[PDB]
Amino acid sequence: LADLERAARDVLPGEIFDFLAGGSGTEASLVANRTALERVFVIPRMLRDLTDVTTEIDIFGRRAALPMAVAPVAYQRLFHPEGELAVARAARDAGVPYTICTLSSVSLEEIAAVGGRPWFQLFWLRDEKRSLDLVRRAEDAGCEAIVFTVDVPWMGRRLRDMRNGFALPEWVTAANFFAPATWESVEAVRAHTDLPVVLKGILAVEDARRAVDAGAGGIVVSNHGGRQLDGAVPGIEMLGEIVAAVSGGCEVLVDGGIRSGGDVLKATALGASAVLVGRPVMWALAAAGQDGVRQLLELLAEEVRDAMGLAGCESVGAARRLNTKLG
Amino acid sequence: LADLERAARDVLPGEIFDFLAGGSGTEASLVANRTALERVFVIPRMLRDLTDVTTEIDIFGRRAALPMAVAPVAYQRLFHPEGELAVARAARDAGVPYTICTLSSVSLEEIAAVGGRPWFQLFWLRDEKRSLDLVRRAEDAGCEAIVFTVDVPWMGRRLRDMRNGFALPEWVTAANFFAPATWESVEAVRAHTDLPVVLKGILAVEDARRAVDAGAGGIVVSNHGGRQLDGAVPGIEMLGEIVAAVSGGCEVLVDGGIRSGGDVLKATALGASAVLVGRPVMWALAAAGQDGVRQLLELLAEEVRDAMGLAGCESVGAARRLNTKLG
Amino acid sequence: LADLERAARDVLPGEIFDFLAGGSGTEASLVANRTALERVFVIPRMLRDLTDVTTEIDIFGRRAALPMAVAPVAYQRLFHPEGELAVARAARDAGVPYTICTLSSVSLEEIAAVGGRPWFQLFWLRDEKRSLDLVRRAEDAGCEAIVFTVDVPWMGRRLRDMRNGFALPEWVTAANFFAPATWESVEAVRAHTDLPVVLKGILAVEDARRAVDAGAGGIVVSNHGGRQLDGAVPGIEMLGEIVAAVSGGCEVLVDGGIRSGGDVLKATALGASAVLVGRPVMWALAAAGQDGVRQLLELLAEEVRDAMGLAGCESVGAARRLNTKLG
Amino acid sequence: LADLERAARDVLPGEIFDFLAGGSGTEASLVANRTALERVFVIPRMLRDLTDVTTEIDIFGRRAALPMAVAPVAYQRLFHPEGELAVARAARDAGVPYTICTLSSVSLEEIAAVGGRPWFQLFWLRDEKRSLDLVRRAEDAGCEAIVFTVDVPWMGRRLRDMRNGFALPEWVTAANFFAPATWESVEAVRAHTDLPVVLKGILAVEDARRAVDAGAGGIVVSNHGGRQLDGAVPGIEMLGEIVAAVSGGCEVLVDGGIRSGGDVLKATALGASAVLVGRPVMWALAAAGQDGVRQLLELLAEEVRDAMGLAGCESVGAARRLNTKLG
Ligand SMILES: Cc1cc2nc3c(=O)[nH]c(=O)nc-3n(C[C@H](O)[C@H](O)[C@H](O)COP(=O)(O)O)c2cc1C
Ligand SMILES: Cc1cc2nc3c(=O)[nH]c(=O)nc-3n(C[C@H](O)[C@H](O)[C@H](O)COP(=O)(O)O)c2cc1C
Ligand SMILES: Cc1cc2nc3c(=O)[nH]c(=O)nc-3n(C[C@H](O)[C@H](O)[C@H](O)COP(=O)(O)O)c2cc1C
Ligand SMILES: Cc1cc2nc3c(=O)[nH]c(=O)nc-3n(C[C@H](O)[C@H](O)[C@H](O)COP(=O)(O)O)c2cc1C
Ligand SMILES: C[C@H](C(=O)O)c1ccccc1
Ligand SMILES: C[C@H](C(=O)O)c1ccccc1
Ligand SMILES: C[C@H](C(=O)O)c1ccccc1
Ligand SMILES: C[C@H](C(=O)O)c1ccccc1
Ligand SMILES: C[C@H](C(=O)O)c1ccccc1
Ligand SMILES: C[C@H](C(=O)O)c1ccccc1
Ligand SMILES: C[C@H](C(=O)O)c1ccccc1
Ligand SMILES: C[C@H](C(=O)O)c1ccccc1
């Protein structure tokens, strides 16, 4: 919700609010994530049984309360002193998976100890052995999926951060402590874990197909929130094509700009299994810590149920069968 | 007309003007109703006989003076002290059907006693028997059609109203005194009345077809003025597809954003039998009571005749055969 | 040119500037005339012989210096005291046809006496005999074509004029001194003159075809400058379709929003034989009388030649064979 | 980069900043060059080997460091006292071809003596012999290609310059010291040089094909930065069609609005061999002379490499095989 964004702008130092809000380049891809969702209209169905509307899904072996997970966002102590623990606690209590980052400001084992349904996001290290160590650590700690970020051979050029000369406060560190990943890297991860491997940052149809062929359990259709290639298509504009191409071969998630339950409904109707949400979770953390994130997740939960029922869907499956029109 | 909107803003308390003007969510569907009409252009015909231009139609057994009816709008005493009686009187005198609401602030029997061509809008009650009682009451009072609202399994989230903490003044009540409706509910209504049943809030083509199959006498292609699902397609964007699918099997009405006789002409040219008009009627009621609504209906009548003749149509039938271009 | 518009706003009384600038309704069709031209892009050709670029055309038996004529605009004494005589003189000297109006503020015989290539615009009178008298007068005076306006069964609702309570100054009159025209009216005119009859205000393809069948020598594809049906498609959006349908059976002119030589080039490339120009001619008349109109026509002549040659066209015929892309 | 534009506005006299920034007419084609690029989105590829990303290309017999050359811009002493020598030096040092203009404010032999990879832009003179002299001079001086400008049968109408009454300062001259070029002119140039002839200002597909047939070694798909025909399509909107039509028969360059490495990537993905960059180079020259241009070229080099790798391309060839989506 947009209320939370203003609250976060008030509390955070400007340069940190910019690290959070910004995109790469001219921010064309950042803006397009929103434009893309705004142009999607749902064709709701009427007069269906709504006696037992449920927003639950099963994904990567487990039930989730909503078709949504908290996206990986590095260094969450930048936003609140409890950082990742505040968010992970709120996510647990909401029944939403939480993605622990490779660049988390609290150790992955500490965040996993919170409980809930933790996933682990991997950045490939120069050193196949350390990469595979991180994976093994995550698995030993009870993470349920490996979200391999594949869109960051190196970081995008964030002009806000360069303009600010933004740097990590010395009170924030990479508590778990890089090279471009390839398909060979994916295979090394797949061969070393029994957890589902989910490739995050896929936009081309042939890469979605190859992800299935590679043994991925999922993909996240994503332009990294407009922070990587400036001019990369929004994931929501590729999603329907990608869902058709994989034809049920893996879960297909999407992110970028999801700001309401209606947006979740749009993504579902375009064929997404679930969405990730990034910036809004951080606005809520900045504004009110754990209880802020809890309130955000409850509002999203309400909005998703509302939208589903208004659209005649008693389940997320039904929402996936909704048609859309581009406006 | 837009003159009336400003007049109403001046006279009404802010929170009531917001209950009236607002949509759900981000108001995306509210804005899109207008955008959709603005992008439609008519291809007028020339050099046709206009000696006897008539705006009359026959609908649900009766003549109407224009291809238009007053939409159901709950609690019209919110806008003027004479509420529904002022509007119903003006509608009668203009030869326009008036839709009496389930949530009317004057009793349905009182409004029907005004005369004219009253229709009755139904909200389904938890309790098939009370629902069917309302229907029987309406029929006994001389209502000519049952407008079953099928897009409100529960109310949309109106953020204006939540922000205002808007509530009914204790001087406005539901003078006729809820559960999600299904297709079984439609059948129960159809089996209990000889009046045409008109399903209001249809947007999917397959729901329009099923409405015909269900024995509806009409549908209203509608996103509830942008007040229900935020992100629901505008009815005007579905209308041509829907008209083709039903292929004369029931009357096909449309609403949402109709603000002029030219807009009526656009809807007709897209295949609508008639339109509903909501907010403008309430602006006129707020501004000048019965005579306000009369002046609005006379202006609309003038604008419809003007537009028709400019477009070479001596009858509404001819207007339906006009072609359009999207701009 | 836009310089002239400001100059005219300065000199004219507000209500007269509004009679000139305004459209009907919400001015949707007025704005769309401009939008339509702005979205058209020309694909220029290179490396062609331009040794003898000519902007001349033959139309309705006679040479014209440019593919352009002055549109019919009633009551030109509203804008300058010399009214129609100032404009007709400038047009003559530029080699541009001038359309004398039925509602001219100087008599048709006086304006024709100026010389040049006068056409005569007809409004159909209640009274076939008086209509045919006007036609005969025009023909006896040496007018070369009858421009039958077919888009005014009655006048559009000009809200600017209603708001101003605009009325003709008693010093402006209809110096030549109404009913809806039909196809029978066209035939009566065609049977009573040997001059080419040009139907002005055609937008539907089937009306363009029927115009040919009816023996018209031309049509003007036009929404009457956005002053008749509000929501009528711009002529420029129908032109290519219309040109294809008539397949050389009559001349096909266009008007609405032409504001430069580049706009003339766009219209030509879409298949127009020539354009009409209305409002700009009146801005020039208001600003500087006869010499104002002369300067406007010389600027347009320069701009047309410039655009043609830049686009590799040594003749208007070649310009008609240019391709376009919609942006 | 946009930083440089403001810096240049500060330092340059207004009328010179306008000679540089302006387009012809209403500047519709100038704006459309930017719009066109902004609507192009790239579909990046992931997980490819990026161990040796190279931005180098071979063109017209020689290696270039980037798929980019400095566009021909007349009279560069207008912007800085070192004019063309400052730019040519920076280009040399960056490994970017520099296009020497026929209307250069330093002699072509002086600029060629700088070294690097100089090309020579030709304007056709009234006098085939002088034209061919210029060509021979360029060839004798070591220029590697002849960029024949074919979109200037005469200059466009630059309203900024007419409004300013802009004229060359007497301290700027055409140091190398006109008629419309035709296909016969192209042949005369082709027959008189062994250098590749590159036709600059092609927009029609059939002109691109005829350029190949004529023995051109390249074309530049271009609307001359919006300075020639106002309303000419942007080159970027024709590029994909043109690349398909020539089917490898010559190099296909593009210009107009390229303002970042991401823009270069878009052009490549649409099929361009390379781009030209005009205005930005002049902003950098105005702001900081030779070192300004060097800094611009290093920033562009960084941005091109960044974008390529983010998009999974280890070479420009790979970038050409990227797909795009129009937004
Ligand atoms: C401050 C910030 C940090 C991020 N850090 C990471 C990261 O460490 N790993 C990752 O895969 N994605 C990262 N992302 C991208 C998000 O996972 C997600 O793709 C993007 O934020 C989704 O868009 P949304 O923020 O619009 O909801 C980050 C995003 C932001 C805004
Ligand atoms: C204040 C308000 C109250 C409404 N109440 C009802 C209602 O009780 N029943 C119903 O079916 N629709 C209701 N509607 C929706 C209208 O019938 C209609 O679909 C919508 O207003 C049409 O759009 P328009 O207002 O843009 O003309 C209401 C609309 C407004 C603005
Ligand atoms: C003040 C005014 C008066 C007009 N009078 C007439 C008229 O008497 N007869 C006619 O056929 N068209 C008339 N028109 C329409 C023009 O002939 C022409 O279709 C329209 O002005 C073309 O558009 P433009 O003004 O954008 O160039 C008039 C237009 C204006 C602005
Ligand atoms: C001030 C100026 C002068 C120019 N002079 C020439 C010229 O002498 N020869 C030529 O072929 N193009 C000329 N051009 C056009 C450029 O070569 C190029 O096509 C255009 O600038 C590319 O667009 P960009 O400026 O947006 O990068 C000129 C452009 C500008 C802005
Ligand atoms: C992936 C993520 C991002 O900001 O996109 C990131 C944040 C900080 C440092 C490295 C990467
Ligand atoms: C005009 C409207 C819009 O884009 O607001 C629209 C919605 C759905 C499909 C087409 C157009
Ligand atoms: C259907 C209608 C509405 O506002 O959409 C309504 C108004 C007041 C209370 C309930 C429903
Ligand atoms: C450009 C114009 C508009 O959208 O204003 C248009 C009207 C009808 C069809 C296409 C375009
Ligand atoms: C046709 C023309 C017009 O304004 O469109 C007109 C002007 C004055 C009076 C009648 C008609
Ligand atoms: C993007 C550009 C525009 O509309 O400015 C365009 C010109 C011609 C064709 C398509 C797009
Ligand atoms: C081609 C170029 C231009 O400005 O487009 C030019 C600049 C000055 C003088 C002549 C031509
Ligand atoms: C909505 C978005 C945009 O134009 O910003 C888009 C990007 C690529 C393709 C279609 C739409």
Among C38, C42, C47, select the one facing D229 at the smallest CB separation. C42
**Could you please report the per-residue DSSP string of D282-300?**
HHHHHHHHHHHHHHHHHHH
Atom of ligand 6 minimally distant from the CA of B36? 1
β-pairing verdict for B57-59 and C40-43: unpaired
The structural domain count of chain B equals 1
Domain membership of residue D230 as a residue range: 2-326
Tokens of D41: 């989105």
Residues across chain B: 327
| Strand ranges in chain D using DSSP code E only, listed in sequence order | 40-43, 57-59, 62-64, 68-70, 98-100, 118-122, 146-149, 197-202, 218-221, 251-254, 274-277, 323-326
The answer to whether the CB of C227 is under 6 A from ligand 9 is yes
**Which of B160, B224, B279, B294 is labelled catalytic?**
B224
Question: What b/e sequence results for D20-48 when a residue is b if at least 16 CB atoms lie within 10 Å of its CB, and e otherwise?
Answer: bbbbbbbbbbbebbbebbbbbbbbbbbbb
Cα–Cα dist D15/D166, whole Å: 7
Two tokens, residue C223: 């929404």
- Closest ligand to the CA of D30: 4
Reply yes or no on whether D80 is catalytic: no
- Across the interface, which of C25, C151, C231 has its CB nearest the CB of B46? C151
Shortest distance, CA D162 to any CA of chain C (angstroms): 13
CA-closest candidate to residue B54, choices B322, B321, B324, B319 = B319
Q: Phi and psi at residue C326, in whole multiples of 5°?
A: -90, 130
Contact A47/B207, CB-based, under 8 Å?
Answer: yes
CATH number of C27's domain = 3.20.20.70
Tokens 């999801």, located at residue: A258
Ligand 4 pocket (Cβ < 6 Å) reads D 19-20, 33, 71-74, 101, 103, 121, 149, 200, 222, 224-225, 227, 255-258, 276-279
Residue D1 and residue D11: Cα distance in Å, rounded? Answer: 17
Q: For residue D139, what are the CA distances in angstroms to C93, C258, D189? A: 52, 47, 12
Summary count for chain D: helices (H), strands (E) = 13, 12
Separation between Cα atoms, residue B253 and residue B244, nearest integer Å = 13
Q: After which residues is chain B broken (C to N over 2.5 A)?
A: 177
Give the distance from residue A202's alpha carbon to the nearest chain D alpha carbon, in angstroms.
7
Q: CB within 8 A of B66, min separation 6: which ones?
A: B55, B56, B57, B94, B95, B96, B264, B274, B297, B300, B301, B304
DSSP 8-state class, residue A271: T
Nearest Cα to A196, choosing from A215, A213, A217? A217
Instruction: Estimate to the nearest angstrom the gap between the alpha carbon of D299 and the chain centroid.
Output: 18
Give the resolution to one decimal, in Å: 1.6
Residue of C163, C229, C237, C238 to mutate, interface with B, max B Cβ within 10 Å: C229
Pairing mode, strands A40-43 and C218-221: unpaired
Q: In the 3-class helix/strand/coil scheme, how is chain C assigned residue by residue? A: CHHHHHHHHHHCCHHHHHHHHCCCCCCHHHHHHHHHHHCEEEECCCCCCCCCCCCCEEECCEEECCCEEECCCCCHHHCCCCHHHHHHHHHHHHCCCEEECCCCCCCHHHHHHCCCCEEEEECCCCCHHHHHHHHHHHHHCCCCCEEEECCCCCCCCCHHHHHHCCCCCCCCCCCCCCCCCCHHHHHHHHHCCCCCEEEEEECCHHHHHHHHHCCCCEEEECCHHHCCCCCECCHHHHHHHHHHHHCCCCEEEECCCCCCHHHHHHHHHCCCCEEEECHHHHHHHHHHHHHHHHHHHHHHHHHHHHHHHHCCCCCHHHHHCCEEEEC
